[PDB]
Ligand binder design. Structure first.
Ligand SMILES: OC[C@H]1O[C@@](CO)(O[C@H]2O[C@H](CO)[C@@H](O)[C@H](O)[C@H]2O)[C@@H](O)[C@@H]1O
Ligand SMILES: OC[C@H]1O[C@@](CO)(O[C@H]2O[C@H](CO)[C@@H](O)[C@H](O)[C@H]2O)[C@@H](O)[C@@H]1O
Ligand SMILES: OC[C@H]1O[C@@](CO)(O[C@H]2O[C@H](CO)[C@@H](O)[C@H](O)[C@H]2O)[C@@H](O)[C@@H]1O
Lengths: 447, 447, 434
């Protein structure tokens, strides 16, 4: 392209041994580098989509290859190894002098040592997206790629103590990589887990032990989908039911299985839901239901076919009804509402980067526009995509594409936002491209 | 024995096909049965110790056998199975009419569907204790028992995403079986996990795939111990260090790895610790340190040899210094301090059974006296055991052996306490028996 | 001449081959005028007087520097909070200082130090020099600037002294009024009775009596006085009224009522329209004793307060800078959510080793030798092991300061001065008045 955004993305590209292998997190000139000079696996996904749609796919291929290689490297902290299948949160290229080499952060350098659980899932989704964009079936089939997928599946499908098909994680294990009360069974992890499973179903070779893998995958998918749809789904009708639940019920055949106390349901959600609206809850576990709306989880649930067609309609209906809360002056609010006061103190451990309506704690994130556009297109609500894109276009180039926006409605540029945040740039590009050729959404959606 | 307590325990015994296989949770006449007419695996352990020391060991043997059989039964909820190794929280004997049969609760009937993670660990510890009390090596070696242990190990040793040797659980996965902010990496789970591993090391046959199991076990133990001792351990010196930590540090070689913000350290702990005192923290995870003192975790850490000899001394030094907080009018407070106010609301989801200084939320639990006596004996602090026992003896028979006591110092009989709680009865019995023959502590301790 | 002596020697700054001051800290990782004071005292008692002389000379030169912020020229008398050697001298006058705080206490410490130098060396010549006499007059011009109000105290913005961050110590904080009083008394001796010098002396006499009266009568807090204020009627209008500053008793905090011992007493932290700050500030109260601003009875009462509330005010590390700490919402509102001054940390109720020298001096003057002994003992038990932290935190000072610099010079000099004061009490006359 000849646009400003195309050129900005082009300079983000990281080269290794004369080859493009990824993109930097940001091209901010004045902020301390911290880990933003690295290539984050989750960040790379919207950049990858841009390159796949342009038709220059070697950077995507090289990324997938190098990341797979990174997985093979021994990862350790104090004589203990995680599962071999773990993908790192990010990597950078280090020049010792002379020859180049790749250094990864698997969680052993990460702040608070958060595990990048979503990384390995995005890896699979990007592998699928590569395949569907290019038609190249050879990459995924190759021995090392097959083995790589299986290692990821081993970690995902690992046996639980719990009675539930969902996946258990520590706090800060996905896009929200800091302590945000998204421990246990956060929506985003479950939705990505579900999507990656469907992808693996397309990607795996039957020959070898794959048959057993595929049967595991098919089994988990059904259970996962049933559980998510029946227990996470929130609308007025279901809320009315939960609110009338009786506490401390014991036995197999009971209504309140997770022992939710109605007195704990927050006041804001009853007023917030429209009659024809609804969404997937943020979390579910013993005695706990997180009613916070999480944007990525809900939008990807539409794209992955996890939410039903009607349920997808009701999520979009919610976006329309509460446009100022979830889009406001910058698509898209990452979650709603913000944690405030003592709740912010207890749940985040007084994390100053996640003060109310900032960053993960109810900030607005430009990148999420690409998921929103795709979901809007999938649900036949093109007009919402136009409006969201229009709003983002009106401020991003002028604000130099900040990492995130703050405030109840995203009025403020993020407190500590990097400028020239690559996936803020890629996010808008992808959204416009989807809008131009809706079919491309099939790279990331499932029938 | 000819004592009142001996007879009370005797009537708790559950018979199945003319054989003793366990004990009821309570013999309370007026409370709704709920799940207290069942045999809880964790509850049975102190009863089992009484019977092992008396020398009537068939009930213990039958319990171990039947529980192992229960493990084999298909456990499911909505087309999803947990790992085969899962032990149930409790079982009861049901008379359809004519023939008897055993029905278990694996979490699918449990309130809030909490998983009984500690159950499978106690199963192994009781198996070891049986063996050491009786000298019978045949039970554990038998094919079905070996397989049973390995299934449990498969679940415990299952591969993580995290960089840590600790074990990840949902909230309410141990003795505290309700939502209490003990999700992620609660001390008790880690200590029991560590103890069960050492037991498995004694129990496993080398022949077969056992060699690989034993090497896994030996590997995990070292990592687990190092991690617990270095990161969970709290005293003035370490607290001074943590408080001076700088937030948001990135990289491998940093002091504040889990990104604890000093401003979040609670005010109470600085005043609470004596100079020569210390303890293992309640939890550790991304951006999170739980400074609450958990009694079972800390005492079992002494018995399991997890805490160092000095560290064990410093824990007991803490008990002595804060005797009124942790023992008060009834040994032993389950954890300190209580969650109060909005913290109680947010963390427990307004759980009315766990109001401040009640039940799990800072209540006093008679059963924990047996662990305290054993730890006191192991640390050469017999006098503390005498005093704790004296206090419990002064009220338990008169109060009809309540399940728990409430209040800052356990003045009140628990709000919803069952009377004739079996492990309240067994707990005192075990403590007196340990006191009479200190060597018996070797049934539950490790060198 | 222990390790502490070596660290202080190593702290010394040189400029063109001459010792001119000491660094704030030798933390493995400049000169603050207030920080230099306890160092100076050690040098004077050890006979190394030239470093103190040079400091007074060099800082005097800094005063005359033309400075401005945004096209505005302030009063000439201003002294910087700190300076650094770069060779040439460069000064921070609050121009580059965080929050643009004005170092009001700097110039008063300058005056008190000039006096101490003279008392220590018996050299009367330095202060008599025209440049020194001019320096003093410039400081007085600013201090004695005419006011709109009937208060003879000195008006300042927040964070204008040792506590140099926003801490609710704006308006008429004790420390400033006490240092103001002491500096005026020092100037009373130091000024030349020249034609010009006479007019300055007139203004000094004209403000000194009024200031002492105001502080003693309206800042003094004890049970008896507290009982009066608690019974004040609100919204009194007139010249002859009891509740002049219109204190509303329902706002008197519950802690002070139970805090005061029967024989205890202290100077309040602040006074102004509708405002009494009941917080205890250690430096203001201890210097009031030394400067002779508090009466003998009042000095004894303050020491009684220390003895009675030893855990609050001394605890693990002498001495708590102020009590009690702003907490919760109050901390939010009054400090503007200042992360360096969280409850029981730093300015907001931390414990500061340097204050030990003031406490020792005050205890010696009041005859409470035992309290000096115990205070010093507590400090000696920790400081070396902890590497002389800048400050300590917590209700009782158990924790080493959150962001404390190690090898903080006035923590080191503070202990030395205290020990040497204890060894020879006559030396307290450097910072005290007959
Ligand atoms: O160690 C995790 C650490 O990384 C951060 C930023 O340093 O993560 C943010 O930035 C990444 C790069 O764009 C994003 O991938 C991520 O989603 C975002 O949260 C911190 O938040 C976190 O402490
Ligand atoms: O479904 C779990 C449910 O069981 C309870 C009591 O019904 O657990 C308590 O009682 C058990 C029997 O003594 C103990 O093993 C357990 O430690 C104790 O918490 C409830 O607390 C819980 O909701
Ligand atoms: O570290 C120096 C830095 O700290 C500040 C902020 O409070 O001042 C503190 O340190 C000074 C030097 O020791 C003290 O004189 C002062 O009392 C203390 O508050 C800044 O002013 C300074 O740049």
């Amino acid at each position: 392209r000849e646009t400003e955004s195309w050129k900005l993305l082009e300079s983000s590209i990281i080269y290794y041994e004369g080859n493009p292998i990824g993109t930097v997190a940001a091209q901010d000139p004045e902020l301390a580098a911290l880990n933003y000079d690295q290539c984050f696996l989750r960040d790379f996904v919207p950049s990858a989509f841009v390159f796949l749609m342009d038709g220059q796919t070697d950077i995507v291929r090289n990324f997938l290859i190098e990341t797979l290689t990174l997985q093979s490297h021994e990862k350790e902290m104090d004589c203990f190894q995680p599962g071999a299948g773990l993908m790192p949160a990010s990597f950078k290229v280090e020049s010792d002098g002379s020859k180049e080499y790749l250094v990864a952060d698997f969680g052993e350098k990460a702040i608070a040592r958060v595990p990048p659980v979503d990384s390995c899932m995005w890896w699979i989704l990007l592998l699928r997206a590569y395949e569907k964009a290019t038609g190249d079936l050879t990459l995924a089939r190759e021995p090392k790629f097959q083995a790589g997928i299986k290692l990821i599946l081993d970690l995902c499908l690992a046996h639980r103590f719990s009675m539930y098909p969902t996946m258990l994680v520590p706090d800060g294990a996905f896009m929200i990589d800091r302590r945000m009360g998204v421990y246990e069974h956060p929506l985003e992890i479950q939705v990505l887990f579900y999507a990656a499973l469907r992808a693996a179903r397309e990607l795996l070779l039957p020959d070898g032990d794959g048959e057993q893998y595929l049967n595991k995958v098919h089994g988990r998918l059904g259970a996962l989908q049933y559980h998510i749809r029946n227990y996470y789904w929130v609308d007025l009708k279901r809320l009315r039911e939960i609110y009338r639940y009786k506490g401390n019920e014991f036995g197999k055949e009971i209504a309140n299985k997770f022992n939710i106390f109605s007195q704990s349901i927050p006041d804001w959600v009853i007023e917030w839901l429209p009659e024809k609206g609804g969404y997937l809850a943020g979390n579910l576990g013993p005695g706990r239901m997180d009613f916070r709306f999480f944007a990525l989880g809900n939008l990807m649930a539409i794209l992955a076919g996890l939410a039903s067609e009607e349920e997808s309609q009701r999520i979009m209906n919610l976006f329309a009804h509460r446009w100022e809360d979830l889009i406001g002056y910058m698509p898209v609010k990452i979650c709603y509402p913000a944690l405030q006061g003592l709740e912010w103190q207890i749940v985040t451990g007084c994390d100053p980067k996640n003060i109310p309506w900032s960053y993960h704690n109810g900030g607005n994130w430009p990148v999420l526009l690409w998921l929103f556009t795709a979901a809007a297109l999938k649900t036949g609500k093109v007009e919402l995509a136009h409006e969201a894109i229009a709003i983002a276009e009106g401020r991003l180039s002028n604000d130099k594409f900040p990492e995130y926006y703050d405030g109840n409605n995203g009025r403020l540029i993020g407190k500590e936002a990097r400028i020239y945040q690559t996936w803020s740039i890629a996010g808008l590009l992808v959204a416009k491209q989807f809008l131009a050729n809706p079919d491309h959404v099939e790279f990331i959606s499932f029938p």
